Amino acid sequence: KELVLVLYDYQEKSPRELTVKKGDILTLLNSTNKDWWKIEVNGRQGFVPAAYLKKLD
């Protein structure tokens, strides 16, 4: 799976969003929307704004 780094803490604001912490490593599920990426971590799947994320590497 493609690894993604979380740059900054993100707090979920809607039911399909994931709360993530700076430094977390997530798996990328879908990046076809440039603004909101679907990611997976700890058996959960959801969305985080792409501005908080960087593909490794």
Side-chain angles (χ1 to χ4, degrees):
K1 295 288 189 60
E2 187 168 6
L3 304 184
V4 170
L5 176 64
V6 177
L7 303 179
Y8 321 113
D9 291 353
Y10 181 73
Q11 171 66 211
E12 65 199 59
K13 289 182 52 182
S14 75
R16 299 209 69 192
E17 297 179 23
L18 277 169
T19 292
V20 293
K21 295 297 186 299
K22 170 171 49 65
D24 284 353
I25 299 295
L26 324 175
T27 288
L28 182 60
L29 293 178
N30 193 287
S31 58
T32 62
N33 189 288
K34 66 192 178 180
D35 289 313
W36 280 89
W37 289 356
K38 195 180 186 173
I39 56 76
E40 179 175 28
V41 64
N42 296 334
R44 295 194 182 75
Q45 298 185 357
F47 293 86
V48 176
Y52 287 81
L53 306 175
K54 186 64 178 57
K55 294 184 179 68
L56 291 182
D57 175 351

